[PDB]
Write a protein that binds this ligand. Structure first.
Ligand code: GDP
Lengths: 246, 165
């Protein structure tokens, strides 16, 4: 894009970025404009007499390059950019900061046969990298990496305990536990931002499946009470009180 | 060239993982030990001079995760609701998935009621009659399957692929 031929492509992206300020911030409107812009610039990469040209993979990389450049510029305007998203982030952070202190694998129906003794530490850490990145793709990759790590660790546990291959019954509870333990900041806003701004053609397949798992994890976690983690009413509230004290 | 999202629904131990592993990998735990997980699979099938690419989504079957399931079955073209023929509570639960799928999604979904571990005789607790009758009255079909012996595993997916609107 620093090439003298790319001149007007650069002017086209820059004028999108500045003409994005002109309208009052609105998530559902904004993300429509961004995807339309992505679709159009995508089309303009492949159709360009100069670019005909690149392999499919290379064209896909330019799409991600475009996504990263544009979203980095638009980040503060579009990320956690209203009161209800800020409130929801804080509620989720608050709930997890307490629950992580007393939650155990049996609370979520994780069987001792699928125990990991690091408590899937590496997966926790992959998830926490989420606020190291601004591009939706790089945020999503942290999520996908977390999921791939969990899956490989579940596979090892079934090898060691001569069990059947793990499914969603194994994976989801472990993703929930791992998310509670990692408590990544602005998890609500991060998921919404990926869902809204990831190149739409790419939030598909296995990526979409694991993304749906983490959205469902968020939802479960938001709604944790005594019954949903199999603790007595009085035991749960007592656990929450000690958690607030530390 | 025909993409279809297929959800697997059923409670833990019913045989969700076993069914799809048989279908996808031609493997069963007793004969071939583990290699990959089974929560997600893409699988292609040939039907009457065509092709169906199944995207297969597994769901967590425990009760505490029940209210999350609509997120998984949203927009599915199809669902296999699995129960274990040796476990009556699994069948009660399979029936609830069917009513929910009828209430809360999605009119042209192809639902298949799978009655699994059919190879198991002494322990059988759910009659083919109850399962068949139930399916017949609720617009879906019942198939007895066995992941262990491979009986009706390939067939149940073909039979879903056959019915795709
Ligand atoms: N005999 C027999 N056993 C089965 C069959 N399908 C699954 N199983 C076993 O029943 C247990 C639960 O099955 P699984 O696939 O893990 O169920 P899931 O929790 O629903 O995924 C496992 O130990 C399987 O080996 C079958 O068709 N016949």
């Amino acid at each position: 894009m620093r090439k003298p031929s790319a001149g007007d492509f650069v002017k086209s992206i820059k004028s999108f970025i500045v003409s994005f300020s002109n309208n009052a911030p609105d998530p559902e409107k904004d993300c429509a404009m961004v995807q339309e812009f992505f679709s159009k610039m995508e089309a303009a990469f492949r159709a360009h007499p100069l670019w005909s040209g690149c392999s499919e993979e290379e064209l896909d990389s330019a799409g991600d390059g475009l996504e990263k450049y544009v979203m980095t510029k638009l980040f503060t305007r579009v990320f956690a950019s209203n009161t209800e998203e800020v409130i929801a982030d804080e509620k989720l952070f608050q709930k997890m900061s307490l629950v992580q202190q007393f939650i155990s694998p049996e609370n979520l129906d994780i069987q001792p046969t699928f125990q990991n003794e690091s408590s899937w530490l590496l997966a926790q850490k992959e998830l926490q990298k989420i606020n190291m990145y601004k591009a939706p793709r790089d945020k999503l990759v942290c999520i996908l990496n977390c999921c791939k790590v969990i899956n490989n660790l579940l596979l090892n546990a079934s090898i060691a305990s001569n069990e059947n291959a793990p499914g969603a019954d194994e994976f989801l509870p472990v993703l929930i536990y791992v998310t509670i333990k990692a408590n990544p900041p602005q998890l609500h806003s991060n998921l919404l931002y990926i869902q809204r701004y990831r190149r739409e053609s790419k939030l598909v397949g296995e990526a979409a499946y694991f993304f749906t798992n983490i959205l469902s994890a968020e939802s479960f976690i938001s709604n944790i009470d005594a019954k949903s983690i199999s603790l007595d009413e009085a035991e749960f509230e007592k656990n929450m009180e000690s958690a607030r004290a530390r | 060239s025909i993409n279809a999202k297929l959800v697997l629904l059923g409670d833990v131990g019913a045989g969700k993982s076993s069914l799809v592993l048989r279908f996808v990998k031609d493997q069963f735990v007793e004969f071939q030990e583990s290699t990959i997980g089974a929560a997600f699979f893409s699988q292609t099938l040939a039907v009457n001079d065509a092709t169906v690419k199944f995207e297969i989504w597994d769901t967590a079957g425990q009760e505490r995760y029940h209210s999350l399931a609509p997120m998984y079955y949203r927009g599915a073209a199809a669902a296999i609701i699995v129960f274990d023929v040796t476990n009556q509570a699994s069948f009660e639960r399979a029936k609830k998935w069917v009513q929910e799928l009828q209430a809360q999604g999605n009119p042209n979904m192809v639902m298949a009621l799978a009655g699994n571990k059919s190879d198991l005789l002494d322990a059988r607790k759910v009659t083919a009659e109850d399962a068949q009758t139930y399916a017949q009255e609720n617009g879906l079909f019942f198939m007895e399957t066995s992941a262990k012996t491979a009986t009706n595993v390939k067939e149940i997916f073909y039979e879903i692929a056959r019915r795709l609107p």
